[PDB]
Amino acid sequence: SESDAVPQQQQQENHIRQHDLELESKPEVLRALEREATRPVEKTVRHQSEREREWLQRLVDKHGDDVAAMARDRKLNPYQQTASDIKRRLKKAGLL
Amino acid sequence: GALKYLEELSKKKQSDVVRFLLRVRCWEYRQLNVIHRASRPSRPDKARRLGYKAKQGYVIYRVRVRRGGRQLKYQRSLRATAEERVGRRCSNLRVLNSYWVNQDSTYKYYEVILVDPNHKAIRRDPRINWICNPVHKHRECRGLTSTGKKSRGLNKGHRFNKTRAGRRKTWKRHNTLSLWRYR
Amino acid sequence: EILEPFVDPPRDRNYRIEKDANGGIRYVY
Amino acid sequence: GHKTTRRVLKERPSRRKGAQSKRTQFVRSLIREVAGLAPYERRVIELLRNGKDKRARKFSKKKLGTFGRAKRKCEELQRIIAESRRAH
Amino acid sequence: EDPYPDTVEWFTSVEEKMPLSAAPEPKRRFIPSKNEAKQIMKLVRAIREG
Amino acid sequence: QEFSELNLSEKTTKAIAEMGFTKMTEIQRRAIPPALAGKDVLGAAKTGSGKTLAFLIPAVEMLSSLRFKPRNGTGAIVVTPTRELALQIFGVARELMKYHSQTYGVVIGGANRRAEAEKLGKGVNLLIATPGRLLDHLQNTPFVFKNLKSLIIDEADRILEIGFEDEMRQIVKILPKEDRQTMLFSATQTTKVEDLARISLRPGPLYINVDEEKKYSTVEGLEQGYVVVEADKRFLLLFSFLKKMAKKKIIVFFSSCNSVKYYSELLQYIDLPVLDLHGKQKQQKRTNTFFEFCNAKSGTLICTDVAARGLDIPQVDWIVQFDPPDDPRDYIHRVGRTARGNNGKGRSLLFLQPCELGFLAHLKAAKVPVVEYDFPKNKILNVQSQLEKLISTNYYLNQSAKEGYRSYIHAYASHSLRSVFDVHKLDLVKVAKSFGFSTPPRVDITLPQGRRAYGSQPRQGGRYK
Amino acid sequence: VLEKTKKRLTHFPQRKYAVKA
Amino acid sequence: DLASMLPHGRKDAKFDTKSRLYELCELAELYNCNNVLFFEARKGKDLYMWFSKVPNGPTVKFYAQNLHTMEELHFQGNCLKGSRPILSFDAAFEQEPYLKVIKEL
RNA sequence: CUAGUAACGGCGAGUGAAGCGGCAACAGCUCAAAUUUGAAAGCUGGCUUCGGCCCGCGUUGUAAUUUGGAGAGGAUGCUUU
């Protein structure tokens, strides 16, 4: 039952995926196409550059794991990168 | 943002500054030839909004056309006659657009933008190299310029029924007898 | 001459105002 | 007609074509000082200063061609007189 | 009449105390140049490759 | 009772626990269960007694039970007289709704009109509004409000005091009256408040008073200090004040949360440790920071007026009012008691500019003693050049400077005393100099019938949308 | 091609898909 | 034809339908006229005639149909341009109160 | 197909469309108006040992971003080469 008369709640199952879609007695060609679509894919992960690793290393070496201090630093953070963004780059790098 | 100031200045053509400048330049153009080359556009705001760039391959030409009539009325504008005479003068270039610069009691003055289709700067650059294609040879002769599109009535709506998709094309389609195989 | 202590002090027509047939604000020029 | 439930749509940015830009109004007012006045605008300016406001609107219709254009043109030129006596 | 009247400065006599644009400034006006670092790294690849 | 003892949803119950609130006060205990049951309730509670949480809990439970979405409409609407109370309600609703999928938002005067219209079009399910901006959005901005299930009026007596009696009458007319629960609060009941309660409520409501009648009043010996300082040297006098009046207890009241958060982060680069208290921080951090300041022997606390008027202020040496107060009557009677109270000798000081000399005449008409302070101009730590260099170099403090400067004029513009604190009198260049700007940022300062058209008559009929 | 066109084709190219009967 | 009838009449050009109807009063004040005869057309086919005293007086809106102008060669009659006519009214004009207002206009 | 319909012609000889609908085929985009201003980042030549050397065009504006059922800028967290 709907307290609010909206037709969209009948059909329901602000950000969505953009580059793909999340999905859930028959001919052989269709079965072969189903296996090719659901075959597991190599990840091809993206690494960071060498100069990016030294910039993150010098940042941890002076400030430990206090991301708020590295955001306020200027010599070691010439672009005013936000503490939330630096913490994301640290987690990708391996050092917290 | 100097070009927004220039756009508003060209709105007031009868003001003291613009009428003084248009007076002393009308005399200067009459001392020169009927068709001659301008090093720079005299109205840089207007040329830039019509598609001019300071690149090698873009040229500006100035032209006079005698105003008046032939009581018969010519179906193309004086801007169209200005474009065709410049294109005949510069046969290797392509006419992109043209704009009004000055007006006398005997002559109307226009400045034409031309693009060289064989210059390497034009050919390597997209968003201009459509003019290098051979379908754009002499656009001013066939009415493909801005003044040509106005004269041929190529506008949407119920007020341009006879002139959308060509006047002679629409007349011909309405005057052929279509006979099918099973009548 | 601030009357109440911490509040604000209190604060050419070309027509005449008359009454219309439905009892509205008729303007006479 | 048919009973279909209505919904409200997003405000169209093309419907905002009615210009409210503060920068463009700045540029128009600054250019008006620089450029000056047309010959017919001087006639309207003189007639408004002398008090012949009726003659000004008749003359400006005959130069522009519409009551809406004549009304606006006398209104911009009226505010030029107001701001000129304030600067002077 | 006065055929060449002087200009009455009705608009420019009042000095504007604020910028016209209320748009924010980007980070790039406050930080070192991103274009500069890209041209430098292009040169680093060339010296490294010889 | 306790919030866990009250039967609520798992997301709201765990959100209150994250705030650290366990006990339940007077206005929360006997206004929330009648609101959840459905009955409409009006109350008379002092602000800062927890009544903000009293109308938010039934609002969130209604939205969550009916499973609201951004395509549905506005849900709950909260009406609030001034800007700085609306950001506190938005601040506490952000913490209360962090585990739900519904949307919350604020529409206030002096902000971006086009950005608010875009927020309203996308769909905000809990709207906190100033009456002036709400009327303009309901008349002009296209957004869904047909699914309105609750209307809350906050500080009703302050709304009629500002002069929004006409707008609140038009707000009730536009909003759907059927099957919605209305819940209005006002500390003092007048005839206009009863008139507002009559046109907004549906027959007979339940009426609550928690307010105390016995209030301590002023005498002719309650000294209030003032200092006259130019607009370009207001912060420099404050910074010179705090850096030598350290190893003492100092509280400074501000006008906006952005003004608090800018000066809190500014004072970390010019080397002056100051505790802060604003609405962008979490509620657990806010009460912890006040607990540290209450138990401290010396330090500096920075907060707003409307955060301070709900909190219990300890014995301190100085109370500083850097910006104009929201309620000047409640300012003098309360912080006069707060400085002069207890065995400690506390002194209350208010910053004045030369254009606000009308407050002294208001001060003398009320017959409350004044104390002027001399302020020698030699003893000034001229850190203007260091502050100006650092603002133009650091981007985050540049943003905090514009947001504080923008919120300072807007709170100045919404002030009740038009005559004393006039916005068209103070030099905008000098105010931005104190904030750390060479040139003032662009702020709009604004955000009887005569000579009708000839022969025009009033409108008789037509369908206008 | 323009580099604004190249960015759009890099991140949103024409995909391979089928529709069941 | 009707303007040639009226020596005290001044002809006026196309009026903007996007304007307001009381701007006719500001218009007639400009030409110093206390009567407005407004020809309003709809859809390029229909005609509506308005009669009004300009500052404050009454205003009547008619729908005009069955138009036959002077240039039609079946009339055989002619008169002086600007002569003072004899106005022939009907007895119904003096009985109905709304027809009494129309008669004075 | 609409349709010899509307509409216009001494409302003669006559002239004469379009919207909707059913199909064929479908695909969307590029500029000017904004300062990269913490770095004309853009391009024509012609000398080359083919990697990079100079001569210039151009700030009266060449690259990147944006093109009004949009967009920018910050923040934010996933997702793409």
Task: DSSP for B30-44, please give it.
Answer: HHS-SEEEESS-SSH
Q: Which of F424, F403, F437, F433 is nearest to F234 (CA)?
A: F433
Q: Which of F295, F325, F292, F296 is nearest to F308 (CA)?
A: F325
Tell me, in Å, how far CA of F407 is from C1' of I33?
32
Collapsing DSSP states into helix, strand and coil, what is residue H34?
coil
Tell me, in Å, how far CA of E19 is from C1' of I76?
30
Q: Residue A39 has what DSSP assignment?
A: S
Instruction: Tell me how far apart the alpha carbons of residues A42 and F253 are, in angstroms, rounded to a whole number.
Output: 59
Contact between residue B61 and residue B35 where contact means Cβ atoms under 8 Å apart: yes
Question: Which chains touch F (3+ CB pairs under 8 A)?
Answer: A, C, D, E, H
Tracing tokens 């040879």 back to the chain, one arrives at B137
Q: Residue F185 has what DSSP assignment?
A: B
Longest dimension (CA), chain B: 74
Nearest CA in chain G to A18: G12
Angle at B38 between CA B35 and CA B40, to 5 degrees: 160
Burial of F122-151, coded b for 16+ CB within 10 Å and e otherwise, reads ebbbbbbbbbbbbbbbbeebebbbebbbbb
Q: Which of F66, F76, F64 is nearest to F14 (CA)?
A: F64
Cα dihedral across residues F350, F354, F359, F360: positive or negative: positive
Collapsing DSSP states into helix, strand and coil, what is residue F14?
helix
Instruction: Tell me how far apart the alpha carbons of residues B36 and B62 are, in angstroms, rounded to a whole number.
Output: 5
Collapsing DSSP states into helix, strand and coil, what is residue B12?
coil
Instruction: Tell me how far apart the alpha carbons of residues F340 and F342 are, in angstroms, rounded to a whole number.
Output: 7
CA-based end-to-end distance of chain B? 67
Phi, psi of F16 (to 5 degrees): -65, -35
Which nucleotides along chain I are within 7 A of a protein C-beta?
A: 16-18, 29-39, 41-45, 51-52, 56-66, 68-70, 72-81
Instruction: Tell me how far apart the alpha carbons of residues D22 and F110 are, in angstroms, rounded to a whole number.
Output: 17
Q: How many CB atoms lie within 10 A of CB A22?
A: 6
Strand partners, F59: none
**B35-38 and B58-66 beta bridge pairing:** antiparallel
Q: Which of F292, F53, F31 is nearest to F181 (CA)?
A: F31
Q: In chain H, after which residues is the C-to-N distance over 2.5 Å, breaking the chain?
A: none
Work out the minimum CA distance from D52 to partner chain H, whole angstroms.
11
Q: How many CB atoms lie within 10 A of CB F461?
A: 4
Judged by a CB distance cut-off of 8 A, whether residue H54 touches chain F is yes
Instruction: Tell me how far apart the alpha carbons of residues F302 and F250 are, in angstroms, rounded to a whole number.
Output: 9
Burial class (CB in 10 A: 0-12, 13-18, 19+), F81: buried
Instruction: Tell me how far apart the alpha carbons of residues F281 and B126 are, in angstroms, rounded to a whole number.
Output: 52
Instruction: Tell me how far apart the alpha carbons of residues E15 and D82 are, in angstroms, rounded to a whole number.
Output: 18
Enclosing H/E stretch for F184: strand F181-184
Q: Which of F314, F320, F335 is nearest to F260 (CA)?
A: F320
Angle at H83 between CA H78 and CA H84, to 5 degrees: 120
Q: Residue F23 has what DSSP assignment?
A: B
Q: Which of F438, F408, F430 is nearest to F421 (CA)?
A: F408
Distances (CA, A) of H86 to D49, F101, F112, H5: 46, 83, 68, 12
Question: In this structure, which amino acid lies at residue F13?
Answer: T
The reply to whether D22 has its C-beta less than 7 Å from any atom of strand I is no
Enclosing H/E stretch for B62: strand B58-66
- Asked whether H and D share 3 or more beta-carbon pairs under 8 angstroms, the answer is yes
Strand order in the sheet with F347-352: F275-276, F299-304, F249-254, F318-321, F347-352, F224-228, F370-372
Instruction: Tell me how far apart the alpha carbons of residues F347 and F370 are, in angstroms, rounded to a whole number.
Output: 11
Rg over CA atoms, chain B: 20
Residues in chain F: 465
Q: DSSP string covering D34-67, please?
A: HH---HHHHHHHHHHHTT-HHHHHHHHHHHH--H
Query: If you count DSSP H runs as helices and E runs as strands, how many of each does chain H have, helices first?
Result: 4, 3
Instruction: Tell me how far apart the alpha carbons of residues A96 and A87 are, in angstroms, rounded to a whole number.
Output: 7
Contact between residue F443 and residue F288 where contact means Cβ atoms under 8 Å apart: no
Instruction: Tell me how far apart the alpha carbons of residues D56 and F22 are, in angstroms, rounded to a whole number.
Output: 77
Q: How many CB atoms lie within 10 A of CB B101?
A: 21
Nearest CA in chain H to F458: H22
Enclosing H/E stretch for D25: helix D22-35
Instruction: Tell me how far apart the alpha carbons of residues F464 and F24 are, in angstroms, rounded to a whole number.
Output: 50
Contact between residue B80 and residue B142 where contact means Cβ atoms under 8 Å apart: no
Q: Which of B88, B12, B3 is nearest to B50 (CA)?
A: B3
Nearest CA in chain G to A19: G12
**F76-79 and F126-129 beta bridge pairing:** parallel
Instruction: Tell me how far apart the alpha carbons of residues B102 and H49 are, in angstroms, rounded to a whole number.
Output: 46
Instruction: Tell me how far apart the alpha carbons of residues D56 and D48 are, in angstroms, rounded to a whole number.
Output: 7
Collapsing DSSP states into helix, strand and coil, what is residue F239?
helix
The two structure tokens encoding residue F298: 């010396």
Q: Which residue is nearest to nucleotide I36 (CA to C1')?
A: E35
Q: How many CB atoms lie within 10 A of CB F323?
A: 20
Residues in chain D: 88
Burial class (CB in 10 A: 0-12, 13-18, 19+), B18: middle
The two structure tokens encoding residue F127: 């709207």
Instruction: Tell me how far apart the alpha carbons of residues F457 and C28 are, in angstroms, rounded to a whole number.
Output: 9
Q: DSSP string covering F48-79, please?
A: TSS-HHHHHHHHHHHHHHTT--TTT---EEEE
Contact between residue F236 and residue F383 where contact means Cβ atoms under 8 Å apart: yes
Collapsing DSSP states into helix, strand and coil, what is residue A22?
coil
The two structure tokens encoding residue G17: 């898909």
Phi, psi of F41 (to 5 degrees): -130, 130
Tracing tokens 């066109």 back to the chain, one arrives at G5
The two structure tokens encoding residue A82: 């936000």
**C25-28 and C16-19 beta bridge pairing:** antiparallel
Directed axis angle between helix F428-435 and helix F234-244, to 10°?
Answer: 30
Tell me, in Å, how far CA of D18 is from C1' of I67?
18
Q: How many CB atoms lie within 10 A of CB B86?
A: 25
Burial class (CB in 10 A: 0-12, 13-18, 19+), E16: exposed
| Residues of D within an 8 Å Cβ radius of E | 22-23, 26, 29-30, 32-33, 36, 80, 83-84, 86-88
Instruction: Tell me how far apart the alpha carbons of residues H19 and D66 are, in angstroms, rounded to a whole number.
Output: 11
Q: DSSP string covering F347-385, please?
A: EEEEEE-GGGTHHHHHHHHTT--EEE----SSS----HH
Collapsing DSSP states into helix, strand and coil, what is residue A63?
helix
Tracing tokens 């609703």 back to the chain, one arrives at F93
Q: Residue D9 has what DSSP assignment?
A: P
Contact between residue F442 and residue E22 where contact means Cβ atoms under 8 Å apart: yes
CA A6 to chain centre: 34
Collapsing DSSP states into helix, strand and coil, what is residue D83?
helix
Tracing tokens 């018969």 back to the chain, one arrives at B72
Tracing tokens 């705001």 back to the chain, one arrives at B45
In total, the C-beta contacts within 8 angstroms joining chain C to chain F are: 39
Enclosing H/E stretch for F385: helix F384-393
Q: Which of F188, F138, F135 is nearest to F158 (CA)?
A: F188
Contact between residue B17 and residue D35 where contact means Cβ atoms under 8 Å apart: yes
CA F174 to chain centre: 26
Contact between residue F338 and residue F319 where contact means Cβ atoms under 8 Å apart: yes
Q: Residue F111 has what DSSP assignment?
A: S
Instruction: Tell me how far apart the alpha carbons of residues F364 and F449 are, in angstroms, rounded to a whole number.
Output: 38
* Interface with F, mutate which of D8, D57, D71 (most F CBs under 10 A): D8
Instruction: Tell me how far apart the alpha carbons of residues F397 and F391 are, in angstroms, rounded to a whole number.
Output: 6
- Asked whether H and F share 3 or more beta-carbon pairs under 8 angstroms, the answer is yes
Tracing tokens 């206390």 back to the chain, one arrives at H34
Work out the minimum CA distance from F460 to partner chain H, whole angstroms.
14
Across the interface, do D83 and E12 touch by the CB < 8 Å criterion? Answer: no
Instruction: Tell me how far apart the alpha carbons of residues F374 and F253 are, in angstroms, rounded to a whole number.
Output: 21
Contact between residue F82 and residue F327 where contact means Cβ atoms under 8 Å apart: no
Enclosing H/E stretch for H63: strand H59-64
User: CB within 8 A of H88, min separation 6: which ones?
Assistant: none
Distances (CA, A) of H2 to H9, H10, H37, H39, H99: 9, 11, 10, 11, 21
